[PDB]
Design an enzyme around this catalytic site. Sequence first.
Site, mmCIF file in Angstrom:
data_model
loop_
_atom_site.group_PDB
_atom_site.id
_atom_site.type_symbol
_atom_site.label_atom_id
_atom_site.label_comp_id
_atom_site.label_asym_id
_atom_site.label_seq_id
_atom_site.Cartn_x
_atom_site.Cartn_y
_atom_site.Cartn_z
ATOM 1 N N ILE A 71 -26.730 -59.767 -7.463
ATOM 2 C CA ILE A 71 -25.915 -58.645 -6.945
ATOM 3 C C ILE A 71 -26.021 -57.920 -8.362
ATOM 4 C CG2 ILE A 71 -23.681 -57.964 -6.871
ATOM 5 C CD1 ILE A 71 -23.226 -60.799 -5.133
ATOM 6 N N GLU A 160 -25.290 -67.342 -2.928
ATOM 7 C CA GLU A 160 -25.243 -68.700 -3.128
ATOM 8 C C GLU A 160 -25.265 -69.289 -1.648
ATOM 9 O OE1 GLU A 160 -26.486 -69.567 -5.745
ATOM 10 O OE2 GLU A 160 -25.212 -69.090 -7.517
ATOM 11 N N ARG A 163 -28.909 -68.840 -0.469
ATOM 12 C CA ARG A 163 -29.735 -69.735 -1.017
ATOM 13 C C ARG A 163 -29.825 -71.349 -0.675
ATOM 14 N NH1 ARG A 163 -27.963 -67.409 -6.710
ATOM 15 N NH2 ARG A 163 -29.206 -65.608 -7.068
HETATM 16 O O1 211 Z 1 -26.784 -59.381 -12.371
HETATM 17 C C1 211 Z 1 -26.524 -61.126 -12.217
HETATM 18 C C2 211 Z 1 -25.822 -60.982 -10.803
HETATM 19 N N1 211 Z 1 -26.181 -62.258 -10.207
HETATM 20 C C3 211 Z 1 -25.836 -63.653 -11.356
HETATM 21 C C4 211 Z 1 -25.667 -64.942 -10.561
HETATM 22 O O2 211 Z 1 -25.035 -65.786 -11.690
HETATM 23 C C5 211 Z 1 -25.226 -62.334 -9.058
HETATM 24 C C6 211 Z 1 -26.185 -62.476 -7.712
HETATM 25 O O3 211 Z 1 -26.436 -63.917 -6.984
#
Ligand code: 211
Length: 246
Positions: A71, A160, A163
């Site tokens: 994200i 997650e 995934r």
């Molecule tokens: O910008 C990193 C955002 N990211 C971190 C994951 O720990 C979220 C998306 O899964």
Amino acid sequence: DVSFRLSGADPSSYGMFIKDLRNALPHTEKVYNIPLLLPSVSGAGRYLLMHLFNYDGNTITVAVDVTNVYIMGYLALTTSYFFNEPAADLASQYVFRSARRKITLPYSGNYERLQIAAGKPREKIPIGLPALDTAISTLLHYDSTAAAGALLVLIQTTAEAARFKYIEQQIQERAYRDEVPSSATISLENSWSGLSKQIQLAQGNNGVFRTPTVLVDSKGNRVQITNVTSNVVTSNIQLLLNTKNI
Ligand SMILES: OCCN(CCO)CCO
Ligand SMILES: *[C@@H]1O[C@H](CO)[C@@H](O)[C@H](O)[C@H]1NC(C)=O
């Protein structure tokens, strides 16, 4: 773009949303029958927009990097919000161009920085679909401390879950009652990159991992993953981070 409505949501419709989220991510090949995310996508095509709606129908749109399921940022009414990191800064060149203003959050998006900002680790933050309704509600009006916690919920209930089937199922179990994530869930979240790398390396090593990945299982026990016959590979993991980004 993919969408999800908390109003009327049930395990089946969340399941369908996570299936759409996975199927929105492009891949040219599979490795042991698991989609291998692209090493690189240029321009605006790098970003998927997830439209999330709370019980009351208010919405945010979340920008997700299709190469790693990170994200980058999100849009709530006319305000855009991005993590304080180069990747997200880049993404802000391509998405939510029409926002009336852009806020950079006072932290990057990795779990360590988010847990600090939120003031508690993932282990103690309940997740589930009702937590996701709360998170969307929180993100609608800027509050940086509260948003950190909302973002930990959002991450884990969307990216997650896409995934890992085990985490999708954990959330399905929490459709109508939040509960803190299982240890196994935390372990997989933490091992994604490593699992991805070893699965890729096993292709040229007869399905055997170069280095074993240690995890925590459904039962709370340490287990060691050594090859692609493991259930984690055959059943659980659904997307692979390209070693070109490891
Ligand atoms: O910008 C990193 C955002 N990211 C971190 C994951 O720990 C979220 C998306 O899964
Ligand atoms: C492969 O992994 C399975 C399941 O973890 C295990 O039983 C087996 O011993 C491993 N095989 C090899 C050759 O390491």
